[PDB]
Amino acid sequence: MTLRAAVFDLDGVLALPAVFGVLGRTEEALALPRGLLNDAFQKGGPEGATTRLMKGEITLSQWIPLMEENCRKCSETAKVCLPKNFSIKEIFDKAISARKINRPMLQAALMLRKKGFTTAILTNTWLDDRAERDGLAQLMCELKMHFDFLIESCQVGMVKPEPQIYKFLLDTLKASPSEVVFLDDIGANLKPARDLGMVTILVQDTDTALKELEKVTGIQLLNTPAPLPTSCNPSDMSHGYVTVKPRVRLHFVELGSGPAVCLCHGFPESWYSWRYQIPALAQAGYRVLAMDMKGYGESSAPPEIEEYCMEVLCKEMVTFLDKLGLSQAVFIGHDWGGMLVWYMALFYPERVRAVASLNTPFIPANPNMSPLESIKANPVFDYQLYFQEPGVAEAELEQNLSRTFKSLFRASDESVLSMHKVCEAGGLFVNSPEEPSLSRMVTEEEIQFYVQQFKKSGFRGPLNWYRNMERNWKWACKSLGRKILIPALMVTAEKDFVLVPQMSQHMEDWIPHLKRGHIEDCGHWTQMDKPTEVNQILIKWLDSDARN
Amino acid sequence: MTLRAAVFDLDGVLALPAVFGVLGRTEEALALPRGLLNDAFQKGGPEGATTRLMKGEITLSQWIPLMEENCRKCSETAKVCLPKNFSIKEIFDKAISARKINRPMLQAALMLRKKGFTTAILTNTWLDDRAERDGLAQLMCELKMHFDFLIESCQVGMVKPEPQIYKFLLDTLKASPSEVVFLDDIGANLKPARDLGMVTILVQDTDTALKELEKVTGIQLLNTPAPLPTSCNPSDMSHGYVTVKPRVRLHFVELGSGPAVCLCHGFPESWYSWRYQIPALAQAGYRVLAMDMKGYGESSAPPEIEEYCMEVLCKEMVTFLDKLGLSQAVFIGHDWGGMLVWYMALFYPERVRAVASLNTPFIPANPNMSPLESIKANPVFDYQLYFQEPGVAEAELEQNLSRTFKSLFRASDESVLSMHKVCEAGGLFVNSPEEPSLSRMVTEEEIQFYVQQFKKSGFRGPLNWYRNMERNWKWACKSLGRKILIPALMVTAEKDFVLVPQMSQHMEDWIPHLKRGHIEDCGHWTQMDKPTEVNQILIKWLDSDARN
Ligand SMILES: COc1cc(CC(=O)N2CCC(NC(=O)NCc3ccc(OC(F)(F)F)cc3)CC2)cc(OC)c1
């Protein structure tokens, strides 16, 4: 009785404008009799060319000549002449290409699945072997990924509105008719579903159909708050492993095609910290490589400290590119990752297409001051001195992993940590709760992912990033005569109280053509705090500075 | 005393023409005093702009203005006027871009390393932050991969001919001066090496220098037979894992950037069977995904037979693309892989940029004949009936893995197997040696790689590809009304006595625009038999039919 599944037509529902709507305009534009194109499209009914195409018996390219002959046949009976320019191939290329995802509809399908619905796309479609077929493929992938099932007439050999396909749908959904709502823009397609007893919504305009669907499901789908960007399910990702030297292999996650964009997380994070950027960046036309940095996750975590100086970390990233066969990548870092990407740009500009850092400014080494002196001359960096002694901070951070990340991963108005009193107090969590509340930015499940990751190797490796102050300083001094002249983006976050925006104020002295982004009401954990804003800044910058 | 290391200069030795040679012509072309450009380039000596650039103190972009001022200063002392068009940036862009690998030199370095030499590149070079820097990066990667060490003045802060860099070289090589031969096109660079006592060759013309190097090493480097293409070292590859459904994950190897090219091996092979194509295809501008097919290697090998029908195999390849975020890939198959790629093109043309098969023709299902009847009506396919009974062929093939692959992987003039008497004789190796000789196509090490791979899961999974004759037939019949109209390449091999070229003779009936390649004196194992010819055919076809 209570709905438990939602089925969406594609053309005219999830994807607008519908092909019929474009063809309708094509008829007018070309001064053809009203409906002639639709007549030709449907000639023969169940036994005609278009039903054979929709059942997969023939390909779209095979079907164009038949469509052409139907159009001639139709114009002849109508005592009209088709234009000299008449091309079914061009007409459908246009129509197919004009079709965009109906975002309010997709987001309602997503909301329904979030609340426990099985969702499916049921569409009459064709095997597309046009030279331009990649466009449609990209559209289906982007929709496909958000649904439990994609049922295509041409893969199952059945078409709407044949009753057999709705029985196939119901068996695929493992649900009974009255448990399913089906949305289609063609009433003929609803009749058989209605017969079986499933709820049907005839989609004329999206918002009316969404109101009907809100009513029958009891879920608010119209006027919902803005949803977060698509996240990553770890077990659905492609996982990559590259041995950069004996005993040291880098793990990374890969999604998308196009120019390589390597994401480098900070302390104490993971490739998963980019989970909101990976699908967006892949969707925007990039090949994203989200890495578990050295010391983290499934990446090797040797115990020696000097394995984590910036010079060794940067050479390994370079080896990573070599072994993957990438002459270049865009490097996008956050926190310690942002520091690493700056030095990638300073020491290996030929391998860096463009560099972006979130939060972490480029601070040139001061040759007249030991890095220890400078750290001591900033109370907010006091916690770093606490990280110096091997084993001390490891023991506090490894004691209760859930508490560690629940205490760390918090929005600016939820913090339970005072980074400036750490040494004095003898610890990072000294005056922090034993069972902190779950921040709004994270779910218990996301927390548990990080917990599982850091069970592999703990915090030794990740803390070792802090234990090469002098080594990094000596190496960084070698670059004091350089400038960064490749495309470069600095993104500041208003409420990062450690890496404050002001820290970046002098960066243009070393990066003259630096581009900037700013995110308001954003704490240190920028990617999960303001994912939608990050993705907009990053994607805009990529398209203007990293793509050709 | 006996040489054990070889050191190669880059500019003028491994890479031609040298930059000085282009600049020399630029001087003439622009009617400048002879040597003025070289004067400006060198002004200041150890303390001038170019030495700072070569030591990494500044970047190339920072160095252009200084070079410009040196050129003005030089033309002024020479009482000449630089042209109105004068641009150091353009002059060096041209020179850098004109530089190609000196293939006879690289191949001698490769031959030397094959015979046990430690090889290194020692070059004065710069940090390249030009907009065009990707060109140089690609050049270094392609050379880099063939050498034990790349020593760049700008990464080590030392330049030829300073004696310190040759002591750094010697320590990097772990060798003593008289054990090393050093080749450079600038005599000033040889003097310090000679001082230490290492053999030096002044490279004026490549062949003279190669004769000198043949003499001192005792190895023939000039007029050597054609070398095989670059192969793959498994532990140097990026390894990818994609879960396509519960219990089933696909393993693949990834190299290169550009359009995705998925390689699908046959029975009983491995991603490694493409080892000669992967680097070539990556080098040609493609992102290669060499897969361990379902049942093989590090890919899952469920025991049930129907997990290996073509329909399930093809859907999983599609899921593989979805989870990697590729709307399309080029599919290049061999043997059973070639059959799979044809059906990828028949059932998922929108996901297939282009399809190529080696050896395996597209044979449309005969709806009036059970596949068993047709197999029985060809003596050469008799071995397939032997593969039908679960466990029988597994036991013979798994008994001695070394013998299995030494018996299988053989050139046409080395065969020890009679595929037409298999059932009668009761086995594939019945009348074959217990310790077969090593074919010329493979090394003992390559054999052992396959041995290790098939220890993971044995032959059940791979043999199950043969055990869905009826299932595959019923599914293939659904496509009998289709044509393959995407870009398509059929490559035949003259001496494949199972998959004979004649088998493909009718393919144009179903693939009208089919392109063809033919390889003479080539047996069934086409990729390792004629790797150089495969790579030429494939790469030519890719550039004309899969790239935009
Ligand atoms: C290394 O020495 C320096 C570093 C800099 C700047 C710089 O590159 N950094 C990046 C790498 C480090 N980041 C880090 O420790 N982040 C971890 C973290 C942040 C906030 C947290 O708090 C909360 F959870 F969010 F609430 C909790 C944990 C230091 C900053 C400048 C300089 O001199 C001017 C010296």
Ligand SMILES: COc1cc(CC(=O)N2CCC(NC(=O)NCc3ccc(OC(F)(F)F)cc3)CC2)cc(OC)c1
């Ligand atoms: C499936 O039924 C069929 C298949 C076809 C053609 C086709 O697609 N094939 C590809 C898949 C199979 N390849 C295979 O078994 N290769 C293994 C192998 C080859 C040579 C060997 O010998 C030596 F080692 F090289 F010496 C040893 C092992 C059968 C051929 C046509 C058809 O009907 C017309 C029916």
Ligand SMILES: [Mg+2]
């Ligand atoms: Mg529709």
Ligand SMILES: [Mg+2]
């Ligand atoms: Mg030189």
